[PDB]
Amino acid sequence: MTWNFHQYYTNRNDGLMGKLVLTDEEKNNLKALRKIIRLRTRDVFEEAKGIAKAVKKSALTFEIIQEKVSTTQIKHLSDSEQREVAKLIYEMDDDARDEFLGLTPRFWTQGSFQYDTLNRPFQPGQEMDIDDGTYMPMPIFESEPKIGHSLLILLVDASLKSLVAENHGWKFEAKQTCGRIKIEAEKTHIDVPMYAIPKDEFQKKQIALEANRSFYELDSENVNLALREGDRKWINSDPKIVEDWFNDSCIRIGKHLRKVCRFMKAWRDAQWDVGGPSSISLMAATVNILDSVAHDASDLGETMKIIAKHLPSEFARGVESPDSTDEKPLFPPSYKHGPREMDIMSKLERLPEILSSAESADSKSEALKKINMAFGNRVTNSELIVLAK
């Protein structure tokens, strides 16, 4: 016997796509959460600019500034953090202060929510992730921006911490590249990386944008990611580079690319409760395979076998980042594998065996059980599986 799994993979009700794609409850929940973070962040910046405006108009003592700070949403930072914000506002000169009073944070989501590969989480501890970047248009800087790294990080933190203080079961986490709100009971977190971008170009592009529509991309090397730990405060990491690479890959390869990428992530979620290869390494390897190996989009069962066969080789050679400015590969080459990478290799080598043995199982029932060794017990309708012609 030979079974075909195309429907097992693609059926939008019962099949794997059916199990992975967010419910509307989940999708609207994520957008509502993002809206709440965006609102609070703009409010907090307005509150801080309010104080700075006061400083400009009349010379206010440091103590008066502290007092004013302690009355705003910034009160949700620790005591020493509040004093630091007051100190930073008190201490900036006319020029920096004028820049600050002209700053309004802007937002743009990146990651799987943006390019539509966000899967419903599988094991306990696994969470849906929305990556909403905050952008701070300021003058081009070589060393350090007019408005300080410290100040900007503190305000975004205050915004996030102020929301946690208003929501049972939310908690704040600081990561190296973002601030995070975790909502365990909803299996969700929102990440907020922060970027500096050129103010003049931002304005020019926004003016162009609004004039040319009725009812754009910045210079990549000036998109600066703020880093929270380490002595390097900023790194040139433009998230649009990955978004564009993936969207262009989808165009070039076809619409089955997003599906097979979801499947590989689902495989990952089933094989490890935490850990496994990154989502981006899986996408990059999969793109490389589909660009170079003949396949048929009308049988994702066959396509998934083709991918599984070639993944070990991709990862063994090291997976290069689509961002050539990246300082490391997305996955190291095999001569540099330690325990972590060896564990990944051994699971990848297992996958094509699982898919093969499912294909040659004795019944539809046994076929389902076998293939569910790769993706977990998510699909339950064995009648999705069809005897190959």
Report the binding-site residues: 110-115, 129, 131, 180, 191, 237, 265, 279, 326
Based on the shown chain and the rule CB under 6 A, indicate whether residue 239 belongs to the binding site for ligand GTP.
yes
Task: Enumerate residues 11-70 that contact Mg ion by CB under 5 A.
Answer: none
Alpha-carbon distance of 334 to 192, in angstroms, equals 33
* Closest distance of CB 220 from ligand TLL, Å: 5
Q: CA separation (Å) from 5 to 99, 267, 298, 369, 373?
A: 59, 15, 11, 12, 14
Smallest Cα–Cα separation from 179: which of 216, 119, 225, 242? 225
Based on the shown chain and the rule CB under 6 A, indicate whether residue 278 belongs to the binding site for ligand GTP.
yes
Which of 51/242 has CB closer to ligand GTP?
A: 242
Which partner, ligand GTP, ligand TLL, Mg ion, none, binds residue 224 by CB below 5 to 8 Å per kind? Answer: none
Alpha-carbon distance of 189 to 170, in angstroms, equals 9
Alpha-carbon distance of 99 to 137, in angstroms, equals 10
Give the helix/strand (H/E) hosting 96. helix 94-101
* Closest distance of CB 135 from ligand TLL, Å: 4
Which partner, ligand TLL, ligand GTP, Mg ion, none, binds residue 178 by CB below 5 to 8 Å per kind? Answer: ligand GTP
Per-position b or e across 47-84, b if 16+ CB within 10 A of its CB: bbbebbeebeeeebeeebbbebbeebbbebbeeebbbb
Task: Enumerate residues 187-246 that contact Mg ion by CB under 5 A.
Answer: 191
* Closest distance of CB 191 from ligand GTP, Å: 4
Which of 8/45 has CB closer to ligand TLL?
A: 45
Task: Fill in the DSSP letter of residue 120.
Answer: P
Based on the shown chain and the rule CB under 5 A, indicate whether residue 111 belongs to the binding site for Mg ion.
yes
Which of 216/335 has CB closer to ligand TLL?
A: 216
Q: Name residue 166's amino acid.
A: E
Alpha-carbon distance of 339 to 308, in angstroms, equals 21
Structure tokens that stand for 50 in this block: 């309010």
Stretch that binds ligand GTP, among 14-22, 100-108, 202-210, 276-284 (CB under 6 A): 276-284
Which partner, Mg ion, ligand GTP, ligand TLL, none, binds residue 28 by CB below 5 to 8 Å per kind? Answer: none
* Closest distance of CB 142 from Mg ion, Å: 29
Which partner, ligand TLL, Mg ion, ligand GTP, none, binds residue 108 by CB below 5 to 8 Å per kind? Answer: ligand TLL
Which of 129/302 has CB closer to Mg ion?
A: 129
Alpha-carbon distance of 177 to 227, in angstroms, equals 5
Number of residue whose CB is nearest ligand GTP? 111
Q: Number of C-alpha atoms within 13 angstroms, CB side, residue 159?
A: 28
Most distant CA pair in the chain: distance in Å?
Answer: 85
* Closest distance of CB 30 from ligand TLL, Å: 11
Q: Which residues bind ligand GTP (CB under 6 A)?
A: 110-112, 117-118, 129, 131, 175-178, 191, 193, 225, 237, 239, 242, 278-280, 321, 323, 326, 330
